[PDB]
């Protein structure tokens, strides 16, 4: 019950770089601002509708045949462009994402990648078509454009191998890997995908796929993360799920979309990354549209407590969370990304929870990088011993004089 508990928790900013393209430098500045504000990780969706990340070797081995690296790359580029041909760019390179991870590591910032499936995979579906894999899309009220058919082995096998190749990359580089599994065939079932899975006795098939993805993460030394949607839908435990999955809990849903309660998932032994929907911001969203516009997300950043999970009340309901995630989405990826908006929402969330967030260590690290008579060395050694790396956002002044004493000793 000491000091450490609050600071040990995760403070995450989520960027939807799957739907919309973000430049390496844009993400670097988000990472820098995250480090400055006191965040711990940057959650970066790279596969979300579009697939905006290419490895150097994209060779895939599936269905007793292989798909050549250059053939895979072109098909993915075409898929992402088919979803949305972003004039700012198509997909991040291996070298760019690698530099982002090392840059973030230098600022005590984790990177949490997300490659979504079996929903939110418009780019992958079309890529598979271009790769010869016929009809990968789910089929209900109409043929889906976002979701994979669970009965199609050819598509399932490829996608598993594809996510596996990404998982091979992020292994040893990042602690967590998010595979999503949210909003199954929402476009093809009027946002009732889990009800449709139940109906056609395919919900067990989804579990098998999700559990496979969790094992794939674990055996590669990655903590599996997924969204809550498809985990124990409607509090039924007829179909079981992997318990080692870090659940990013965003909502309990709405009418006809009966997601499991946080209370039920906690009773199954799950830990939560509090990804409360209240803190959502969709780029370009205005107050007139309702939902997650900027003013509401800033307003709710103080309204909705740090530990409070969606559909629950804190502290009346107090469930185990590893930390909280604030999310920026790009539902309409053509909307202008304005850095100032995200920075304001990020700042607000940190300012209301100064006990959870770190202090600003950018000044300290610059002054420690300037370090190359024994009496003058006595002072330089003394200021170094007096440094405190454990400060939170409430004590910026406390840290400001400690770094000032280091600057004075160095001269
Ligand atoms: C009182 C009541 O419950 N009314 C229902 C109403 O709320 C429902 O509309 C829904 O509202 C929620 C907010 O409470 C909103 O989040 C929902 O949007 C999600 O789902 C739609 C598909 O229906 C999808 O188009 C959106 O993209 C969105 O999905 C998530 O949200 C973010 C940002 O919006 C996305 O970027 C994410 O990709 C996605 N997933 C995650 C994990 O974040 C929805 O509009 C309606 C529904 O008919 O029903 C009322 O009864």
Coordinates of C-alpha atoms and ligand atoms in Angstrom, one line a residue:
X1 CA 0.0 0.0 0.0
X2 CA 3.0 2.3 -0.6
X3 CA 3.8 5.1 -3.0
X4 CA 4.7 2.9 -6.0
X5 CA 1.2 1.4 -6.9
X6 CA -0.2 4.4 -8.9
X7 CA 3.0 5.1 -10.9
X8 CA 3.5 1.3 -11.6
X9 CA 0.2 1.4 -13.6
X10 CA 0.1 1.8 -17.3
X11 CA -0.8 5.2 -18.9
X12 CA -1.5 4.6 -22.5
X13 CA -2.3 6.9 -25.5
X14 CA -3.9 5.0 -28.4
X15 CA -3.4 6.2 -32.0
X16 CA -5.5 4.8 -34.9
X17 CA -2.7 4.5 -37.5
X18 CA -4.5 1.6 -39.2
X19 CA -7.4 3.6 -40.8
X20 CA -5.2 6.7 -41.3
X21 CA -1.5 7.2 -42.1
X22 CA 0.8 8.8 -39.6
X23 CA 4.4 9.8 -40.4
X24 CA 7.3 8.5 -38.4
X25 CA 7.9 12.0 -37.1
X26 CA 4.2 12.6 -36.2
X27 CA 4.3 9.4 -34.0
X28 CA 7.7 10.5 -32.6
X29 CA 6.1 13.7 -31.4
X30 CA 3.3 11.8 -29.9
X31 CA 5.9 9.6 -28.1
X32 CA 7.7 12.7 -26.9
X33 CA 4.6 14.4 -25.7
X34 CA 3.6 11.2 -24.0
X35 CA 6.9 11.0 -22.2
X36 CA 6.7 14.7 -21.2
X37 CA 3.1 14.3 -19.9
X38 CA 4.0 11.2 -17.9
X39 CA 2.5 8.4 -20.0
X40 CA 4.0 4.9 -20.0
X41 CA 3.1 3.4 -23.4
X42 CA 1.9 4.3 -26.9
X43 CA -0.7 2.0 -28.2
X44 CA -0.3 2.0 -32.0
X45 CA -2.9 0.3 -34.2
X46 CA -1.1 -0.6 -37.4
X47 CA -3.7 -3.1 -38.6
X48 CA -7.1 -1.6 -38.2
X49 CA -9.3 -1.6 -41.4
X50 CA -6.2 -0.6 -43.4
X51 CA -2.9 -2.4 -42.9
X52 CA -0.3 0.4 -42.6
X53 CA 2.8 -1.6 -41.8
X54 CA 5.1 -3.6 -44.1
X55 CA 8.0 -5.8 -42.9
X56 CA 11.2 -6.1 -45.0
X57 CA 10.4 -9.7 -45.7
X58 CA 6.7 -10.4 -46.1
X59 CA 7.0 -14.0 -47.4
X60 CA 4.1 -16.0 -46.1
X61 CA 3.9 -19.8 -45.9
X62 CA 0.3 -21.2 -45.7
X63 CA -2.0 -23.8 -47.3
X64 CA 0.9 -26.0 -48.5
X65 CA 2.1 -23.1 -50.7
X66 CA 4.1 -19.9 -50.3
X67 CA 3.3 -16.3 -51.2
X68 CA 6.3 -14.3 -52.4
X69 CA 7.4 -11.3 -50.4
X70 CA 6.9 -8.7 -53.2
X71 CA 3.6 -10.3 -54.2
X72 CA 2.4 -10.0 -50.5
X73 CA 3.5 -6.3 -50.2
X74 CA 1.8 -5.1 -53.4
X75 CA -1.5 -6.8 -52.5
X76 CA -1.5 -5.2 -49.0
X77 CA -0.7 -1.8 -50.4
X78 CA -3.6 -2.3 -52.8
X79 CA -5.9 -3.4 -50.0
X80 CA -5.0 -0.4 -47.8
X81 CA -5.6 1.9 -50.8
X82 CA -8.8 0.1 -51.6
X83 CA -10.0 0.9 -48.0
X84 CA -8.6 4.5 -48.2
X85 CA -5.9 5.9 -50.5
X86 CA -4.3 8.3 -48.0
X87 CA -2.6 11.2 -49.8
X88 CA -0.2 11.5 -46.8
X89 CA 1.2 7.9 -47.2
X90 CA 0.2 4.2 -47.4
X91 CA 2.2 2.1 -44.9
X92 CA 5.1 2.4 -42.4
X93 CA 8.3 0.5 -43.1
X94 CA 10.2 -1.9 -40.9
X95 CA 13.0 0.6 -40.4
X96 CA 10.6 3.3 -39.4
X97 CA 8.7 1.2 -36.8
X98 CA 12.1 -0.1 -35.5
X99 CA 13.3 3.5 -35.0
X100 CA 10.1 4.4 -33.3
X101 CA 10.5 1.5 -30.7
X102 CA 14.1 2.5 -29.9
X103 CA 13.2 6.2 -29.7
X104 CA 10.4 5.4 -27.3
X105 CA 12.6 3.1 -25.3
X106 CA 15.1 6.0 -24.8
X107 CA 12.2 8.1 -23.2
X108 CA 10.8 5.3 -21.0
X109 CA 7.9 4.8 -23.3
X110 CA 6.5 1.3 -24.3
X111 CA 5.1 0.6 -27.7
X112 CA 1.9 -1.6 -27.9
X113 CA 1.2 -2.7 -31.5
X114 CA -2.2 -3.8 -32.7
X115 CA -2.9 -5.9 -35.8
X116 CA -6.7 -6.4 -35.9
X117 CA -8.6 -9.5 -36.9
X118 CA -11.1 -11.2 -37.6
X119 CA -12.9 -7.8 -38.0
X120 CA -11.4 -4.5 -39.1
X121 CA -9.4 -6.1 -41.8
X122 CA -10.6 -4.5 -45.1
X123 CA -7.0 -4.3 -46.4
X124 CA -6.2 -8.0 -45.6
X125 CA -9.4 -9.3 -47.2
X126 CA -8.7 -7.6 -50.6
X127 CA -5.0 -8.5 -50.3
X128 CA -6.0 -12.2 -50.0
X129 CA -8.3 -11.8 -53.1
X130 CA -5.3 -10.3 -55.0
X131 CA -3.2 -13.2 -53.7
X132 CA -5.6 -15.8 -55.2
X133 CA -7.5 -16.7 -52.0
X134 CA -11.1 -16.6 -53.2
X135 CA -13.9 -15.2 -51.1
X136 CA -12.2 -14.5 -47.7
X137 CA -15.1 -12.2 -46.5
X138 CA -17.9 -13.2 -44.0
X139 CA -21.4 -13.5 -45.4
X140 CA -24.6 -12.6 -43.6
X141 CA -27.2 -9.9 -44.4
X142 CA -24.7 -9.1 -47.2
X143 CA -21.1 -10.0 -48.0
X144 CA -18.8 -8.3 -45.5
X145 CA -16.1 -5.8 -46.4
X146 CA -14.4 -5.8 -43.0
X147 CA -14.6 -9.3 -41.6
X148 CA -13.2 -12.7 -42.4
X149 CA -15.3 -15.9 -42.8
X150 CA -14.3 -18.3 -40.0
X151 CA -15.3 -21.4 -42.1
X152 CA -12.7 -20.5 -44.8
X153 CA -9.5 -22.4 -43.9
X154 CA -7.5 -20.9 -46.8
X155 CA -8.1 -17.3 -45.5
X156 CA -7.8 -18.3 -41.8
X157 CA -4.4 -20.1 -42.4
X158 CA -3.0 -17.1 -44.3
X159 CA -4.1 -14.6 -41.7
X160 CA -2.7 -16.6 -38.9
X161 CA 0.7 -16.8 -40.7
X162 CA 0.5 -13.1 -41.5
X163 CA -0.1 -12.1 -37.8
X164 CA 2.6 -14.6 -36.9
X165 CA 5.1 -12.8 -39.0
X166 CA 4.3 -9.5 -37.3
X167 CA 4.4 -11.3 -34.0
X168 CA 7.9 -12.5 -34.9
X169 CA 9.0 -8.9 -35.4
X170 CA 7.5 -7.5 -32.2
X171 CA 9.0 -10.4 -30.1
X172 CA 11.8 -9.1 -27.9
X173 CA 11.0 -5.5 -28.9
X174 CA 7.6 -5.0 -27.2
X175 CA 6.0 -6.5 -24.1
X176 CA 2.4 -6.6 -25.4
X177 CA 0.7 -7.5 -28.7
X178 CA -2.9 -6.6 -29.3
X179 CA -4.9 -8.7 -31.9
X180 CA -8.2 -6.9 -31.3
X181 CA -11.1 -9.2 -32.1
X182 CA -13.6 -6.4 -31.8
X183 CA -16.9 -5.7 -33.7
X184 CA -17.3 -8.9 -35.8
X185 CA -19.0 -8.3 -39.1
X186 CA -20.7 -5.1 -37.9
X187 CA -21.2 -3.9 -41.5
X188 CA -22.8 -7.2 -42.5
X189 CA -25.1 -7.7 -39.5
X190 CA -26.2 -4.1 -38.5
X191 CA -23.8 -4.2 -35.5
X192 CA -25.1 -7.5 -34.1
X193 CA -22.1 -9.7 -35.1
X194 CA -22.0 -11.8 -31.9
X195 CA -25.7 -12.5 -32.1
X196 CA -25.2 -13.7 -35.7
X197 CA -22.2 -15.9 -34.6
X198 CA -24.4 -17.5 -31.9
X199 CA -27.2 -18.0 -34.4
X200 CA -25.1 -19.9 -36.9
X201 CA -23.2 -21.8 -34.2
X202 CA -19.9 -20.1 -35.2
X203 CA -19.2 -18.5 -31.8
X204 CA -17.0 -21.5 -30.8
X205 CA -15.1 -21.0 -34.1
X206 CA -14.3 -17.4 -33.1
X207 CA -13.1 -18.6 -29.6
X208 CA -10.8 -21.2 -31.3
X209 CA -9.4 -18.4 -33.5
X210 CA -9.0 -16.0 -30.6
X211 CA -7.4 -18.6 -28.3
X212 CA -5.0 -19.6 -31.1
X213 CA -3.9 -15.9 -31.4
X214 CA -3.4 -15.7 -27.6
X215 CA -1.2 -18.9 -27.7
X216 CA 0.7 -17.5 -30.7
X217 CA 1.5 -14.4 -28.6
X218 CA 2.5 -16.3 -25.5
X219 CA 4.9 -18.8 -27.2
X220 CA 6.6 -15.8 -28.8
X221 CA 7.0 -14.1 -25.4
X222 CA 4.3 -11.5 -26.0
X223 CA 1.6 -10.6 -23.5
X224 CA -1.7 -11.1 -25.5
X225 CA -4.1 -8.2 -25.6
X226 CA -7.6 -8.1 -27.1
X227 CA -10.7 -6.0 -26.9
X228 CA -13.6 -7.2 -24.7
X229 CA -16.4 -7.5 -27.3
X230 CA -16.2 -11.2 -28.1
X231 CA -15.0 -12.5 -24.7
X232 CA -17.8 -14.4 -22.9
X233 CA -20.6 -12.6 -24.8
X234 CA -23.8 -12.1 -22.7
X235 CA -22.1 -13.6 -19.6
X236 CA -22.4 -17.1 -21.1
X237 CA -19.5 -19.6 -20.4
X238 CA -20.7 -22.4 -22.7
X239 CA -17.7 -21.4 -24.9
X240 CA -14.5 -20.9 -23.0
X241 CA -11.7 -18.3 -23.7
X242 CA -8.0 -18.0 -22.8
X243 CA -7.5 -16.4 -19.4
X244 CA -4.0 -15.1 -20.1
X245 CA -5.4 -12.3 -22.3
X246 CA -5.1 -8.7 -21.2
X247 CA -8.6 -7.3 -21.8
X248 CA -8.8 -3.8 -23.2
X249 CA -12.3 -2.9 -21.9
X250 CA -14.0 -0.1 -23.8
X251 CA -17.8 -0.7 -23.5
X252 CA -20.5 -3.1 -22.4
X253 CA -22.2 -2.3 -25.7
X254 CA -25.8 -1.2 -26.2
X255 CA -29.2 -2.7 -27.1
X256 CA -28.8 -5.9 -29.1
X257 CA -25.0 -5.8 -28.5
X258 CA -24.8 -7.6 -25.2
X259 CA -21.2 -7.6 -24.2
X260 CA -19.9 -9.2 -21.0
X261 CA -19.8 -7.0 -17.9
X262 CA -16.4 -6.0 -16.4
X263 CA -17.7 -7.8 -13.3
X264 CA -18.2 -11.1 -15.2
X265 CA -14.8 -11.0 -16.9
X266 CA -13.2 -10.2 -13.5
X267 CA -14.9 -13.4 -12.2
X268 CA -13.2 -15.3 -14.9
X269 CA -9.8 -14.1 -13.7
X270 CA -9.2 -11.3 -16.3
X271 CA -7.1 -8.2 -15.8
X272 CA -8.2 -5.0 -17.6
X273 CA -6.5 -2.2 -19.5
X274 CA -9.1 0.4 -18.7
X275 CA -9.8 1.7 -22.2
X276 CA -13.0 3.6 -21.2
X277 CA -15.1 4.8 -24.2
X278 CA -15.7 8.1 -22.4
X279 CA -12.2 9.2 -23.3
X280 CA -12.5 8.5 -27.1
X281 CA -11.8 11.1 -29.7
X282 CA -12.7 10.5 -33.4
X283 CA -10.7 12.9 -35.6
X284 CA -12.9 15.7 -37.1
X285 CA -15.9 14.8 -34.9
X286 CA -18.0 17.8 -33.9
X287 CA -20.5 18.4 -31.0
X288 CA -23.4 18.2 -33.5
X289 CA -22.6 14.6 -34.3
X290 CA -22.8 13.4 -30.7
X291 CA -20.5 10.5 -29.8
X292 CA -16.8 11.1 -29.1
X293 CA -16.1 14.7 -30.0
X294 CA -13.1 16.7 -28.5
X295 CA -15.0 18.8 -26.0
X296 CA -16.8 15.7 -24.5
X297 CA -13.6 13.7 -24.2
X298 CA -11.8 16.6 -22.4
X299 CA -14.9 17.0 -20.2
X300 CA -15.1 13.3 -19.5
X301 CA -11.3 13.2 -18.8
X302 CA -12.1 14.7 -15.4
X303 CA -15.7 13.3 -15.1
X304 CA -14.8 9.7 -15.5
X305 CA -12.2 8.4 -12.9
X306 CA -8.9 6.8 -13.8
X307 CA -9.9 3.4 -12.5
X308 CA -13.5 3.4 -13.6
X309 CA -14.4 0.9 -16.3
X310 CA -17.2 1.5 -18.8
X311 CA -20.7 0.7 -17.5
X312 CA -19.4 0.7 -13.9
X313 CA -19.2 3.3 -11.1
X314 CA -16.0 3.9 -9.1
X315 CA -15.3 3.2 -6.3
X316 CA -18.6 1.3 -5.7
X317 CA -17.3 -1.3 -8.2
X318 CA -13.6 -1.6 -7.9
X319 CA -12.0 -4.1 -10.3
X320 CA -8.3 -5.0 -11.0
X321 CA -6.8 -2.9 -13.7
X322 CA -3.2 -2.7 -14.9
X323 CA -3.8 0.9 -16.0
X324 CA -5.8 3.1 -18.3
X325 CA -5.8 3.9 -22.1
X326 CA -7.0 7.0 -23.8
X327 CA -7.9 6.5 -27.4
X328 CA -7.7 8.5 -30.6
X329 CA -9.6 7.1 -33.6
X330 CA -9.9 7.9 -37.3
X331 CA -13.3 6.5 -38.3
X332 CA -13.3 9.0 -41.2
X333 CA -9.6 8.8 -42.0
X334 CA -9.9 11.7 -44.5
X335 CA -10.4 14.1 -41.5
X336 CA -7.5 16.4 -40.7
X337 CA -5.2 15.2 -38.0
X338 CA -4.5 18.3 -35.8
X339 CA -1.7 17.6 -33.4
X340 CA -2.9 20.4 -31.0
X341 CA -6.2 18.6 -30.3
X342 CA -4.6 15.3 -29.3
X343 CA -2.0 17.1 -27.2
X344 CA -4.8 19.0 -25.4
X345 CA -6.8 15.8 -24.6
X346 CA -3.6 14.0 -23.6
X347 CA -2.6 16.9 -21.3
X348 CA -6.0 17.1 -19.7
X349 CA -6.0 13.3 -18.8
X350 CA -2.6 13.7 -17.2
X351 CA -3.5 16.9 -15.3
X352 CA -6.6 15.3 -13.7
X353 CA -4.5 12.3 -12.6
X354 CA -1.1 13.8 -11.6
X355 CA -0.6 11.0 -9.1
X356 CA -0.7 8.3 -11.7
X357 CA 1.4 10.1 -14.3
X358 CA 5.2 10.6 -14.2
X359 CA 7.0 13.9 -14.0
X360 CA 8.8 15.4 -17.0
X361 CA 12.2 13.8 -17.4
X362 CA 13.2 15.3 -20.8
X363 CA 15.2 18.1 -19.1
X364 CA 17.0 15.6 -16.9
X365 CA 18.0 13.3 -19.8
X366 CA 19.4 16.3 -21.8
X367 CA 21.4 17.4 -18.7
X368 CA 22.6 13.9 -18.1
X369 CA 23.8 13.7 -21.7
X370 CA 26.1 16.7 -21.1
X371 CA 28.1 14.8 -18.5
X372 CA 31.6 13.9 -19.9
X373 CA 39.7 18.4 -10.1
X374 CA 38.1 16.2 -7.4
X375 CA 36.3 19.0 -5.5
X376 CA 34.3 20.0 -8.6
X377 CA 33.7 16.3 -9.2
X378 CA 32.4 16.0 -5.6
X379 CA 29.5 18.3 -6.6
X380 CA 28.7 16.6 -9.9
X381 CA 28.7 13.3 -8.1
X382 CA 26.5 14.7 -5.3
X383 CA 23.8 16.1 -7.6
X384 CA 23.6 12.8 -9.5
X385 CA 23.0 10.9 -6.2
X386 CA 20.3 13.5 -5.4
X387 CA 18.3 12.7 -8.5
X388 CA 14.8 11.2 -8.1
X389 CA 13.4 9.1 -11.0
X390 CA 10.3 8.2 -9.0
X391 CA 8.5 11.6 -9.1
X392 CA 5.0 12.1 -10.4
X393 CA 3.3 15.1 -12.2
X394 CA 2.4 16.8 -8.9
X395 CA 6.1 17.3 -8.1
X396 CA 7.5 18.9 -11.3
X397 CA 9.0 21.8 -9.2
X398 CA 10.7 19.3 -7.0
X399 CA 12.4 17.8 -10.0
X400 CA 13.1 21.2 -11.6
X401 CA 15.5 22.2 -8.9
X402 CA 17.2 18.8 -8.8
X403 CA 18.1 19.2 -12.5
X404 CA 19.0 22.8 -11.9
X405 CA 21.5 21.7 -9.2
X406 CA 22.9 19.2 -11.8
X407 CA 23.3 22.0 -14.3
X408 CA 25.0 24.2 -11.7
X409 CA 27.4 21.4 -10.7
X410 CA 28.3 20.7 -14.3
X411 CA 29.5 24.3 -15.0
Ligands
LIG1 C1 -28.6 4.3 -25.1 C2 -27.9 3.4 -26.1 O1 -27.2 2.4 -25.7 N1 -28.0 3.7 -27.4 C3 -27.4 2.9 -28.5 C4 -26.2 3.7 -29.1 O2 -25.2 4.0 -28.1 C5 -25.6 2.9 -30.2 O3 -24.6 3.6 -31.0 C6 -23.3 3.3 -30.5 O4 -22.9 4.3 -29.6 C7 -21.6 4.0 -29.0 C8 -21.4 5.0 -27.9 O5 -22.1 4.6 -26.7 C9 -20.5 4.1 -30.1 O6 -19.3 3.8 -29.5 C10 -20.8 3.1 -31.2 O7 -19.9 3.3 -32.2 C11 -19.2 2.1 -32.4 O8 -19.8 1.1 -33.2 C12 -20.1 1.4 -34.5 C13 -20.9 0.3 -35.1 O9 -22.2 0.2 -34.6 C14 -18.9 1.7 -35.3 O10 -19.2 2.3 -36.5 C15 -18.0 2.7 -34.6 O11 -16.7 2.7 -35.2 C16 -17.8 2.4 -33.1 O12 -16.9 1.3 -32.9 C17 -15.9 1.6 -31.9 O13 -15.7 2.9 -31.5 C18 -14.5 3.6 -31.9 C19 -14.8 5.1 -32.1 O14 -16.2 5.3 -32.4 C20 -14.0 3.1 -33.3 O15 -13.0 3.8 -33.8 C21 -13.5 1.7 -32.9 O16 -12.9 1.1 -34.0 C22 -14.6 0.8 -32.4 N2 -14.0 -0.2 -31.5 C23 -13.4 0.0 -30.3 C24 -12.9 -1.2 -29.6 O17 -13.1 1.1 -29.9 C25 -22.3 3.1 -31.6 O18 -22.5 4.2 -32.6 C26 -26.7 2.4 -31.2 C27 -26.2 1.4 -32.3 O19 -27.2 1.1 -33.2 O20 -27.8 1.7 -30.5 C28 -28.4 2.5 -29.5 O21 -29.5 1.8 -28.9

